[PDB]
Amino acid sequence: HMPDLADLFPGFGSEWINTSSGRIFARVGGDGPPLLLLHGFPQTHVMWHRVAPKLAERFKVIVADLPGYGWSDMPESDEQHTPYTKRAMAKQLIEAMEQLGHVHFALAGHNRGARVSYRLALDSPGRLSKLAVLDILPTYEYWQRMNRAYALKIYHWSFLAQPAPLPENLLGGDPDFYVKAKLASWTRAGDLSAFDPRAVEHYRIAFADPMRRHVMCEDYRAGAYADFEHDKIDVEAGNKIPVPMLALWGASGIAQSAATPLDVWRKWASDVQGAPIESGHFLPEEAPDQTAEALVRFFSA
Amino acid sequence: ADLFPGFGSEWINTSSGRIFARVGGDGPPLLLLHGFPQTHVMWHRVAPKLAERFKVIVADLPGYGWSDMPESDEQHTPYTKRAMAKQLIEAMEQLGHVHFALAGHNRGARVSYRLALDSPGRLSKLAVLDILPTYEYWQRMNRAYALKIYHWSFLAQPAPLPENLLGGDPDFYVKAKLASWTRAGDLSAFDPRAVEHYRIAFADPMRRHVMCEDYRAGAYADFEHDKIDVEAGNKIPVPMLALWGASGIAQSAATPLDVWRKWASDVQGAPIESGHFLPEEAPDQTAEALVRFFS
């Protein structure tokens, strides 16, 4: 519905899926077993545009905007940031998938979307055939690593979780500059060259809306509070994801800082494989051919 | 507004630039150092009572308020506490004070205990208000503390990120920091004319850049300087007073007198019912405690 934004999934349909928490926007393509792809921050569903055509050669691919992101609706939040907790987002996306007739599907997520994905696997494992998480550790593991070096290296988790309207007021002075600098700052080279400029305009246009930025802050507030508490319950109970799992991360990404990610994920999951890729955080755009191959082989095995 | 009746206004030369100070009283010399996001005026409610008994020098930190702004470098050197202490030692020498009493709050309390570790002969007595050493805050930087004092990491990010974010609405940020660290949670502990001093200083992008350089030093060289003293078991030998707010920052993740007793061989301390901004939130109790200690 935005005239000047490009169509980066030629051939894919476009659907508005109703749920009890609001509409989920998605591009839908391909044919075969169902595969849901979930972006994160500060992006929208379009960050899958370099791998989704390849995946659609082998799967029915659903590329969804997270609750409150992109063109999905933005539920009003509350004092516990409930609609933007990964538990609620996973429930909402389960409903959306049911609208399409998918009650058991494959799932790949990146960034916040990967957090939705592993929470979905901890709360509702029967919904997933297989799961892949891209350049993340569990939210509990980010916070347990917190120290001086980590606080300086990855500041925005604590910044964006500050009580409203502090991050909102600071982000709104020059939002284009912030979102473009965040995108560049976590690539391997530190610039915007890994991104299609038409995809960057999608991200910029989303980030230009104060309502969209507020959702992002609520998401990070959930990530500091309820999401962390939910994860803490699972790890202290020794609960492990039983769904077969793939952890892909960037050699220069966020997840690897002071971590061996596959060893971390083996604490959280009983059947997990994984590998690094030479990349910053944004695997599907920085290393699309290798990411698409890793996903196709994992989900088709 | 002039909030220091009976005080002069002095520009004091140093090799790094001028230090501005309000000066009043007579008797033994006592230097007062403010911190962030404030200026010398945050002492306006206690400096009169101290000037009954002391010559009181209320100085703007290097780069803050009306003091000159030395040019920084890639290691943030002029805004390290060791460098700020050296510059203020020079300023005090311009007035003929080579052995003086010293009280600091926030960043200025960090200048102050660094001064005591580097040049203890300069100090008769030291008071620090609502801080622990920079090293101790970073050692405590877990999830809970990263959320509570997020600005230690945010303002320390590489330029221009905090500078750019702060330039959108500087008045909001400075007022938010002031209110959020008080007991009341609003601006009602502050004199409106003092707030206006802080807002005017914070409105200048050059002043905000200094403040970020100060927090960058606090994340790097200040931390390393403190770590050397810890590793060496160095304790401040200057008689010392640690005051902190019962709902302030220093008590948040630590037992303040227990911490300072590891850094100082002769330290007394007390909590005061106050948030972080002791001299404005709790002026009578803060002034009483300082008067009795320095006398």
From Swiss-Prot, chain A:
Instruction: Write down the PANTHER family for this protein, in alphabetical order.
Output: EPOXIDE HYDROLASE
Identify its protein family: Belongs to the AB hydrolase superfamily. Epoxide hydrolase family.
Q: What is its EC number?
A: 3.8.1.3
* Molecular function via GO: haloacetate dehalogenase activity
Record domain AB hydrolase-1: where: 33-271
Query: Which function does this protein serve?
Result: Catalyzes the hydrolytic defluorination of fluoroacetate to produce glycolate. Has lower activity towards chloroacetate and bromoacetate.
Q: Which reaction does it catalyse?
A: a haloacetate + H2O = a halide anion + glycolate + H(+); fluoroacetate + H2O = fluoride + glycolate + H(+); chloroacetate + H2O = glycolate + chloride + H(+)
Query: In which domain of life is the source organism classified?
Result: Bacteria
**Catalytic residues?**
N111 (nucleophile), H281 (proton acceptor)
What name does this protein carry?
Answer: Fluoroacetate dehalogenase
Q: Does the keyword Methyltransferase apply?
A: no
| Site positions per UniProt: Important for enzyme activity | D135
Q: What class of enzyme is it?
A: hydrolase
Effect upon mutating H156N: Reduced catalytic rate with fluoroacetate, but increased catalytic rate with chloroacetate. Minor effect on substrate affinity
Q: Which organism is it from?
A: Rhodopseudomonas palustris (strain ATCC BAA-98 / CGA009)
Quaternary arrangement and interactors, per the entry?
A: Homodimer.
In terms of Pfam families, this protein maps to: Abhydrolase_1
